[PDB]
Paper text:
Multiple transcription factors can bind together to a regulatory element in a cooperative way, and cooperation between the pioneer transcription factors OCT4 (also known as POU5F1) and SOX2 is important for pluripotency and reprogramming. Here we present cryo-electron microscopy structures of human OCT4 bound to a nucleosome containing human LIN28B or nMATN1 DNA sequences, both of which bear multiple binding sites for OCT4. Our structural and biochemistry data reveal that binding of OCT4 induces changes to the nucleosome structure, repositions the nucleosomal DNA and facilitates cooperative binding of additional OCT4 and of SOX2 to their internal binding sites.
The tip of helix 1 (residues 159–163) contacts the C-terminal tail of histone H2A and the N-terminal tail of histone H3; the latter is also contacted by small helix 5 (residues 213–222). The dipole moment of helix 1 and negatively charged helix 5 together form an acidic patch on OCT4 that faces the nucleosomal dyad and interacts with positively charged histone tails there, mediating additional interaction between the OCT4 DNA-binding domain and the nucleosome. In our structure of the OCT4-bound nucleosome, histone H3K27 is in close proximity to the acidic patch of OCT4, specifically to the tip of helix 1, suggesting a potential electrostatic interaction between positively charged H3K27 and the negative dipole moment of helix 1. Acetylation of H3K27 would neutralize the positive charge of the Lys residue and would be expected to affect the interaction between the histone H3 tail and the OCT4 acidic patch. The H3K27ac modification showed only a small effect on binding of the first OCT4, which directly interacts with the H3K27 residue, indicating that this interaction is not required for stability of the OCT4–nucleosome complex. However, binding of the second and third OCT4 was increased with H3K27ac nucleosomes compared with unmodified nucleosomes. Thus, cooperative OCT4 binding to OBS2/3 is increased by H3K27ac. H3K27ac did not alter the sensitivity of nucleosomes alone to Mnl I digestion; however, OCT4-bound H3K27ac nucleosomes showed higher protection from Mnl I digestion than OCT4-bound unmodified nucleosomes. These results suggest that OCT4 induces an inward movement of the DNA on the H3K27ac nucleosome compared with the unmodified nucleosome.
Author numbering:
A (entry chain A): 24 to 134
B (entry chain D): 27 to 122
C (entry chain C): 11 to 118
D (entry chain X): 140 to 220, 230 to 288
E (entry chain B): 20 to 101
F (entry chain E): 38 to 134
G (entry chain F): 19 to 101
H (entry chain G): 11 to 129
The structure:
DNA sequence: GTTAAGTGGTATTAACATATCCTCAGTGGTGAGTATTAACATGGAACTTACTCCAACAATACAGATGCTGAATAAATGTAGTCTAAGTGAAGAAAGAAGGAAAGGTGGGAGCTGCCATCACTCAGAATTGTCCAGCAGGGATTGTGCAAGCTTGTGAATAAAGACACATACTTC
DNA sequence: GAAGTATGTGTCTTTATTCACAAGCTTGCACAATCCCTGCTGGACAATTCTGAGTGATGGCAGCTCCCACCTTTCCTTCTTTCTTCACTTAGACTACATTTATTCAGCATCTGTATTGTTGGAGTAAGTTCCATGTTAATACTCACCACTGAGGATATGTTAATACCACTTAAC
């Protein structure tokens, strides 16, 4: 059918902008080369103490105890995002959705 | 005569006759229930054995068994199992 | 000499405290075993046994059966949220599966 | 007289309407065929819009195009939803026929039938080609 | 409003960084709330077991070994902390 | 004659096989497969009757549980047909690939 | 002294279809059956290899139900009802 | 009394046979422990250590480092098909992940065809 | 301070064999110490129950060999079995 | 004898094959622009090396529990054959599910700016943990006793199996 | 959309099947009583390590604005899978016998625990040092928007010739 438009455009000066996915791919390479913890330590440390209040009051934590929790927590979340990414690609997407997390966790045996 | 083989069959049957006096059990379901008791025995005793090793203890006590129960059984199961275990030790201690 | 009373009767249990004590002693778990450990363990084992047999006898009654078969144990364990978690990585022989069909597979 | 300039003005406006309506010259011939029955080839439309055809032909195709431009403006979808067949002669047939000349300029129909069967051409095609051969040889 | 619930301290950029190390290129906006719920469940299971080891030892401080023991008990053995 | 629609009988099979508990693989073809696999590990191997039966109960429980995971991967991809790509994804997430 | 071969094909397509029905599958691709046979062979090889390892350690020549049960437990696949 | 010789030196092992024997005896594994059990276990433990350290030492050389860090242990373990199966449920602290981007996420290489055009 | 034993010097001895001009960080050695401890319990735990299954009171090099075959994946299992029997052969021949 | 049709003869006409040209799609080449990589110098902290010392290991003897080899043998699995019906394999027709194309819209990405919450550091205190030492009671070891539990038989209740009847649902027709 | 029809599942009844429950026997293990001793507990005390507070600097986050590539919906084609039928091919059952193996003693070999002594390997602490993180710089490589080139297919212009058409001459009919 007659589906036509006007392809008018122009440019004089424009600050450089990367396409939607160039920086995201750059970030994947950056954070897969690195080995540091990706969650801030103080916000995570507060979360650990908040959760532990449900189990015991006036609980003390060693510095390495919170660090051991953080290393395990991010390892669990990074590995879960690897399974979540596979489900998104399985469903012919590149965007991970909450249903991909739920499918990955269900197959693992957590749901 | 064949060698004697111990099982929890007579004890699982006694427990059954309290919860369900008129209900029986087949020998295949009794074999599954015997495997369940043995499997849970190794879990609790194995976990309690590690607790003594962690704390440099040479004895497995009801305190090690109670902690193993809380570590293995989930949620409402652990709360009732601790209640039954504590009630039995209290009753056993008061007897002799 | 005094007449023997089993440690199960002292604790008011059905499971054998004396046998559980021997299995703890000979299972290579610790150098020593306390007096209350077999009593505590037999009480926990007896409770967990009664939990399954209660739910399995109900499933046997729901099928108009007066005898527990492996199918009823499978139905009891999988329909209890906590028992299914305890026995999550356990296969019960001749138990089958739960009758679950996905809703997207049903006819319009 | 002024019929020349009136035709020229009509042809320029005809080109403008054809370009505005989005119709190719082959499509123009197809429309003329499906609305009158005398389908014309796109070469005729080219020679028209460039004003190459002869004056008599100019006047002859004026009315058909007038009617088409005055009619097609209403609806195009339904319209969208008899050539003078001119068989070509391949070069070896041309050479064979030229060989058949230089000996008998005007063959009889008895020989014409044999020639037609020999080279696989239609009798009427061979007859008209023979006539035009004579015609162009008598030009000079 | 400023962040109130502690779980909210696991910021969206922090979750995006974890997805980048996981190879994720594009992230739905509902992932972050789902990820915070997932982490809170994981931490509850580990901390509950880590405290259970602590109260058994009759201590008040949660040591790194209690976390390591709790992780091992869940089939998530962690190296480098004892 | 009478014809059911393509999917009515399949749903009927789902209900009857989820209601029963018997083994769904023929015993002799499975027993022969067990003995063939064991030949790669030890020549002249004997098997108890219950040793093969235990292998079949575990094998069918494993396969049924994998098809449940496989089915969820098919529905996730907006399908009702389970494909080999769904088995591969289910086994990869489980940790077998 | 007897030898066997071509026995994975004895796990027939109808038998695989029944397993998918108990798994709640409504519609099955044509290439599932070959994929399933490879999946079962890998699973059976792992369990039998451990079962024979338990058998040869016991200085035995017959594989017992306990050897299979022990092997399955070692893979995190505890099986109730065989000892 | 004769000159002392370590059981590690008799077996030619760097790992302590006498200490492995003690850990077996006080680990509550069996009522008795044979003389060859600590020797066998120490030799297996030493072999696995050399396997990891060989691969991790190779990793350090690729990053032009003369010192193994946890990153190199993770790279060594995860790049070996058999060490990755042995340590499949193990988390190595400060180890990171293997660099791996799925091929569907990589940008579409330059290419262009033509569909049916009516303009 | 009370003494805390570890496999640090033995892991360093092995490292100086395979890679003479290579050091190891203290965090990596903590990981390598955990690896040796973890594998020790896996083999000793499997060997312990092998004796229980077979009603044996003694853990011997046969239980260790079978536990290595059950736990290590294939090529690792046959290389470790070769190393283990080689050491027991050398140990017995020596004294 | 006159008039309409057939036969040629030459002028016009219009379509074919191929020669040009318009316009649009695909490359790509390209500088700017940004980010990652590599070289090189430097300080410090994190490693390696060299010393006490002390607890764990080895050497030595010996007792006794554990395992070995051969014999005999019962238990158990394998092997082969026979027969019947339950299940499988191949084929054919067709429904509908899978997958591609197309379009639209909206949600996520990239980038920008301001600020506040994280981080690194220090300190002071108190709460906790570790060590040491006495001590005593809980647990092991031992022996004698008896009775609970396992094995072996035996039978009435539970379950499976027809067999007929009553739905309940599915699918085509009207 | 109902009526109607065919198929399947469920339900109640009757009857044979089987398998679980109880009675009867023996054996080994649980209890009772006793003695011994060491692991665990409670107390006191040093010390150590974690919490709470303050501080300054800045970078990471939060909120924002575009805008475009991705997800989702719709529509259509196709071809894959399902359902059914029918021949036939093994699985299941069951006997019967052959062959292997797992169990049991019995005697003896040998291997491990236990105790004691002496030393030496390994852990902790201290000095010695060198690898690596950090910075600055430069070079290289990647991305992205702009400019342009050119080839392909369709659509026009040519050269050229089949094909028809107009006209003079002859020839046939009433």
């Amino acid at each position: 059918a007659a589906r036509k438009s006007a392809p008018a455009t122009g440019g004089v000066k424009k600050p450089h902008r990367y396409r939607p996915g160039t920086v995201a791919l750059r970030e994947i390479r950056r954070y897969q080369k690195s080995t540091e913890l990706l969650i801030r330590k103080l916000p995570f440390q507060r979360l650990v103490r908040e959760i532990a209040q449900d189990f015991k009051t006036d609980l003390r934590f060693q510095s390495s105890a919170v660090m051991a929790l953080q290393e395990a927590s991010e390892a669990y979340l990074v590995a879960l995002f690897e399974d979540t990414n596979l489900c998104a690609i399985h469903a012919k997407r590149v965007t991970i959705m909450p249903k991909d997390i739920q499918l990955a966790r269900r197959i693992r045996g957590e749901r | 005569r064949k060698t004697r083989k111990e099982s929890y069959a007579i004890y699982v049957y006694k427990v059954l006759k309290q919860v369900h006096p008129d209900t029986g059990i087949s020998s295949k379901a009794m074999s599954i229930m015997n495997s369940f008791v043995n499997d849970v025995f190794e879990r609790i005793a194995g976990e309690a054995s590690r607790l003594a090793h962690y704390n440099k203890r040479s004895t497995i006590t009801s305190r090690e068994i109670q902690t193993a129960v809380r570590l293995l059984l989930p949620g409402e199961l652990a709360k009732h199992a601790v209640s039954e275990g504590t009630k039995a030790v209290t009753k056993y201690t008061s007897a002799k | 000499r005094a007449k023997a009373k089993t440690r199960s009767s002292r604790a008011g249990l059905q499971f054998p405290v004396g046998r559980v004590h021997r299995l703890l002693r000979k299972g290579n778990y610790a150098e020593r075993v306390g007096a209350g450990a077999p009593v505590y363990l037999a009480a926990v084992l007896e409770y967990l046994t009664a939990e399954i047999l209660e739910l399995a006898g109900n499933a046997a009654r729901d099928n108009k059966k007066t005898r527990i078969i492996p199918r009823h144990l499978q139905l009891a364990v999988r329909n209890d949220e906590e028992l299914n978690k305890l026995l999550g990585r356990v296969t019960i022989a001749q138990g089958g599966v739960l009758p679950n069909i996905q809703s997207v597979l049903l006819p319009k | 007289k002024a019929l020349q300039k009136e035709l020229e003005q009509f042809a320029k406006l005809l080109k403008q309407k054809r370009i505005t309506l989005g119709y190719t010259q082959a499509d123009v011939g197809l429309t003329l065929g499906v609305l009158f029955g005398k389908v014309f080839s796109q070469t005729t439309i080219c020679r028209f819009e460039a004003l190459q055809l002869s004056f008599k032909n100019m006047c002859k195709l004026r009315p058909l195009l007038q009617k088409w431009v005055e009619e097609a403006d209403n609806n195009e979808n339904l319209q969208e939803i008899r050539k003078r067949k001119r068989t070509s002669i391949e070069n070896r047939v041309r050479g064979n026929l030229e060989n058949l000349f230089l000996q008998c300029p005007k063959p009889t129909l008895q020989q014409i039938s044999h020639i037609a069967q020999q080279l696989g051409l239609e009798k009427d095609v061979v007859r008209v080609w023979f006539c035009n051969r004579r015609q162009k040889g008598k030009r000079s | 409003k400023v962040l109130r619930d502690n779980i909210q301290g696991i910021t969206k950029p922090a979750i995006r960084r974890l997805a980048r190390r996981g190879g994720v290129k594009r992230i739905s906006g509902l992932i972050y709330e789902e990820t915070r719920g997932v982490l809170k469940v994981f931490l509850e299971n580990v901390i509950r077991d880590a405290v259970t080891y602590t109260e058994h030892a009759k201590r008040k401080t949660v040591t790194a070994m209690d976390v390591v023991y709790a992780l091992k008990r869940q089939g998530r053995t962690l190296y480098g902390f004892g």
